[PDB]
């Protein structure tokens, strides 16, 4: 019931096979390629921790208007980290997490002007 | 070291954008080119069956004609389209011709397109039920004529008000010959219409709401003749009827609802 | 045998239905939606002209190592225009053209260093 | 105005990248983050059956350990892998464990990984034919032992040279018990090996190419004993045999090819 995950920076984590399998990617590495240590070439250790707790908290289961209070506080981190989570959720294919992180960015956009947007997200003005 | 959002994969941007509501989406398309293209993505508009200026925060802002075109060109399944007040172009109108199954179309106040585009658009909407093509200031008799020449027979509610000098008896005649099912007909501000045209309305056997407000050359007293429309139920005839005769008119056709 | 194409900037061109149909996109607008004026929301008039001649020249038919001399001279244009052709080819879905333009960018990359690349293509250094 | 290449749609970038050859691809991955991710795309490496450092222009450049890991993790169908000379990591070796059907593996000169990663990798390549795991300076007895403990029986050619003090008779013993099909065996620079281990080679009934160069404690004269290997055909025994005796040895086993 325990599988071993490995971050890009080398650290190893032992997570339950079910929690770990919320990551389609991880799941498919486990099942069609009997990989025990499962290296995640893109996710570093700091990020895997978050990912793991997120999956753990959801082992048992728009708007921004429906983001579970827990998930909200979970995403209470700096852009840097937020950016890394969206990317990590995409590579690992953990729908739910990808789901909440996306709405979270969405909400950061809602209400602002393109300019405000360019500023909070450090986006270059292509038309200039 | 600035967070590298400019590198976020297109997949993700779409995912994010899929979380945004239509009006919001239009905003972001102005953030940067990568976003501008993605916001116009097929996956986000493809299914729309309704689209109206009203429901899209574009009150305080001007939608680049260019971008409006890019988004609408992604819709073929609209049954309700309102671009009321918006300034268009031919490319955009010709593109609207995709939605063959339009039921309701509102272009009042629109401008910037030709009599030809107009024709190609109405011609394609052959199951159109109600059209509001009023006050498109931008146009001439060419347009008006096109309008009455190509609105589908399926039409029941039509509003062609605002063409003081470009709409004439003959045009109402055409309209009438072609659209027997009309129920609501507004021809307000059709200053070229006089009581001689009244006979034409008698061929619309289902017309119950007619409106001739501000048709300044209609001799008020001659209106009585319209109560002779067997199915007529309401008559908007504002600004051309002096109270004196207005009260008479009302007493002569007590079954009518006149304002 | 003659269809009418319309650029984003309003101009209309009459091209033969067969030439016009080298654009899957255009083809499918013609066939499953009887559109006669066929508006191309993205392609402007200057670019449509190139697109049309390209399709015309190929009405009758990796490496960079196999780019037909004609196609080579056809792509002898400035970056701006090149950039617009790749985009236009993608929206219109004209494989062959998309095909040759991509190899042409490929060759501009081959041999250079990342830095050289950043310079010729005005790419920002994400890692700085 | 500057050409907006930084906004080229990912689709196009891939298309472009699909025109580049593998080594070229590795360069561009350092251009910027958007390109770095895309260059690692599945569609571009997914099918590879052979990846050999040799053929990758990586002569005057250092592949970021990180990026090497991200590309190889996209391959499961390799039959030929050579990362010779490259500096790895555990994540990368554990990942190589995907390619269950590896036939030929070259890691000589590699370093930066554990006795455990080594085990998980060899353990997964159960149909491995030839392995060159020579001079991995980085490692100790733990590794060497793992080597001889988990190379598949399927092995016919093996090269474990360069472990002066970490490889011993016992290790050759183990190796021999487990790998009956060996045909080429190189244990050059195995300075812990003396003639007492010679008996072990007699259990490899198909061994025709043995190499013991620079095993400095082998008393030259005792070599004769090796011509007694029924199938032995060639014997590399450089730098430990003085010409005098070397010419004698040759004359004693004229059927042997000794250099």
Curated annotation (Swiss-Prot), chains A, C:
Molecular functions (GO terms): beta-catenin binding; cullin family protein binding; F-box domain binding; molecular function activator activity; protein domain specific binding; ubiquitin ligase complex scaffold activity; ubiquitin-like ligase-substrate adaptor activity
Cellular component per GO, a single term: Cul7-RING ubiquitin ligase complex
Post-translation changes: Undergoes autophagy-mediated degradation in the liver in a time-dependent manner.
Region ranges (Interaction with the F-box domain of F-box proteins): 86-128
Disulfide linkage: none
Biological process, per Gene Ontology: chromatin remodeling; maintenance of protein location in nucleus; positive regulation of ubiquitin protein ligase activity; proteasome-mediated ubiquitin-dependent protein catabolic process; protein K48-linked ubiquitination; protein monoubiquitination; protein polyubiquitination; protein ubiquitination
Positions in coiled-coil regions: none
Keywords: Host-virus interaction, Isopeptide bond, Phosphoprotein, Ubl conjugation, Ubl conjugation pathway
Top-level lineage group: Eukaryota
Modified residues (Phosphothreonine): 113
Gene3D superfamilies per record: Potassium Channel Kv1.1, Chain A (3.30.710.10)
Pathway: Protein modification; protein ubiquitination
Short name of one Pfam family: Skp1
InterPro entries: SKP1 (IPR016897), SKP1-like (IPR001232), SKP1-like_dim_sf (IPR036296), SKP1/BTB/POZ_sf (IPR011333), Skp1_comp_dimer (IPR016072), Skp1_comp_POZ (IPR016073)
Cross-link Glycyl lysine isopeptide (Lys-Gly) (interchain with G-Cter in SUMO1) residue location(s): 124
Assembly notes: Interacts with KDM2B, forming heterodimers. The KDM2B-SKP1 heterodimeric complex interacts with the PCGF1-BCORL heterodimeric complex to form a homotetrameric polycomb repression complex 1 (PRC1.1). Component of multiple SCF (SKP1-CUL1-F-box) E3 ubiquitin-protein ligase complexes formed of CUL1, SKP1, RBX1 and a variable F-box domain-containing protein as substrate-specific subunit. Component of the SCF(FBXW11) complex containing FBXW11. Component of the SCF(SKP2) complex containing SKP2, in which it interacts directly with SKP1, SKP2 and RBX1.
Homology family: Belongs to the SKP1 family.
Job description of the protein: Essential component of the SCF (SKP1-CUL1-F-box protein) ubiquitin ligase complex, which mediates the ubiquitination of proteins involved in cell cycle progression, signal transduction and transcription. In the SCF complex, serves as an adapter that links the F-box protein to CUL1. The functional specificity of the SCF complex depends on the F-box protein as substrate recognition component. SCF(BTRC) and SCF(FBXW11) direct ubiquitination of CTNNB1 and participate in Wnt signaling. SCF(FBXW11) directs ubiquitination of phosphorylated NFKBIA.
Record's protein name: S-phase kinase-associated protein 1
Species the sequence originates in: Homo sapiens
Name of the gene this protein is made from: SKP1
Swiss-Prot record, chains B, D:
Pathway(s) annotated for this protein in UniProt: Protein modification; protein ubiquitination
Gene Ontology BP term (one): defense response to virus
Protein's UniProt keywords contain Transmembrane: no
Recorded coiled-coil stretches: none
Gene Ontology CC terms, in alphabetical order: cytosol; nucleolus; nucleoplasm; nucleus; SCF ubiquitin ligase complex
The LRR repeat ranges on this chain: 50-74, 80-104, 105-127, 128-154, 156-178, 179-200, 204-226, 229-248
Keywords: Acetylation, Antiviral defense, Cytoplasm, Host-virus interaction, Immunity, Innate immunity, Leucine-rich repeat, Nucleus, Phosphoprotein, Repeat, Ubl conjugation, Ubl conjugation pathway
Record localization: Cytoplasm; Nucleus
Modification after translation (UniProt): Phosphorylated on serine and threonine resudues in response to DNA damage, promoting 'Lys-63'-linked ubiquitination of NBN.
GO MF, any single term: identical protein binding
Signal peptide (UniProt feature, chain positions): none
Function: Substrate recognition component of a SCF (SKP1-CUL1-F-box protein) E3 ubiquitin-protein ligase complex which mediates the ubiquitination and subsequent proteasomal degradation of target proteins involved in cell cycle progression, signal transduction and transcription. Specifically recognizes phosphorylated CDKN1B/p27kip and is involved in regulation of G1/S transition. Degradation of CDKN1B/p27kip also requires CKS1. Recognizes target proteins ORC1, CDT1, RBL2, KMT2A/MLL1, CDK9, RAG2, NBN, FOXO1, UBP43, YTHDF2, and probably MYC, TOB1 and TAL1. Degradation of TAL1 also requires STUB1. Through the ubiquitin-mediated proteasomal degradation of hepatitis C virus non-structural protein 5A, has an antiviral activity towards that virus.
Descriptive protein name: S-phase kinase-associated protein 2
Organism: Homo sapiens (Human)
Entire protein: shown range: 93 to 389 of 424
């Amino acid at each position: 019931p325990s599988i071993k995950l490995q971050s890009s920076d080398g650290e190893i984590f032992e997570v339950d096979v079910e929690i770990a399998k919320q990551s389609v990617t991880i799941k498919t590495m486990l099942e069609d390629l009997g990989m025990d240590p499962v290296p995640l070439p893109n996710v570093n250790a700091a990020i895997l921790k978050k990912v793991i707790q997120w999956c753990t908290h959801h082992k048992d289961d728009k708007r921004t208007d429906d983001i579970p209070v827990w998930d909200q506080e979970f995403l209470k981190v700096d852009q840097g980290t937020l950016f890394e989570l969206i990317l990590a959720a995409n590579y690992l294919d953990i729908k739910g997490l990808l789901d909440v992180t996306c709405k979270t960015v969405a909400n950061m956009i809602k209400g602002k002007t393109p300019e405000e947007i360019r500023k909070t997200f450090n986006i270059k003005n292509d038309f200039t | 070291p600035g967070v590298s959002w400019d590198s976020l994969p297109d997949e993700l941007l779409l995912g994010i954008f899929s979380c945004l509501c239509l009006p919001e989406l239009l905003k972001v398309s102005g953030v940067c080119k990568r976003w501008y293209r993605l916001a116009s993505d097929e996956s986000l508009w493809q299914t729309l069956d309704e689209f109206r200026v009203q429901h899209m925060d574009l009150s305080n802002s001007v939608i680049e004609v260019s971008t409006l075109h890019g988004i609408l060109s992604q819709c073929s399944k609209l049954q309700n389209l309102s671009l009321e007040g918006l300034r268009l172009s031919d490319p955009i109108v010709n593109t609207l011709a995709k939605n063959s199954n339009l039921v309701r179309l509102n272009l009042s106040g629109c401008s910037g397109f030709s009599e030809f585009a107009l024709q190609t658009l109405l011609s394609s909407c052959s199951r159109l039920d109600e059209l509001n093509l009023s006050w498109c200031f931008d146009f001439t008799e060419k347009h008006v004529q096109v309008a009455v020449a190509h609105v589908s027979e399926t039409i029941t509610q039509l509003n062609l008000s605002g063409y003081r000098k470009n709409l004439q008896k003959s045009d109402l005649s055409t309209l009438v010959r072609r659209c027997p099912n009309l129920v609501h007909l507004d021809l307000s501000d059709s200053v070229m219409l006089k009581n001689d045209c009244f006979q034409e309305f008698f061929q619309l056997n289902y017309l119950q709401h007619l409106s001739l407000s501000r048709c300044y050359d209609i001799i008020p007293e001659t209106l009585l003749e319209l109560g002779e429309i067997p199915t007529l139920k309401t008559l908007q005839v504002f600004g051309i009827v002096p109270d004196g005769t207005l009260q008479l008119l009302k007493e002569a056709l007590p079954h009518l609802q006149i304002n």
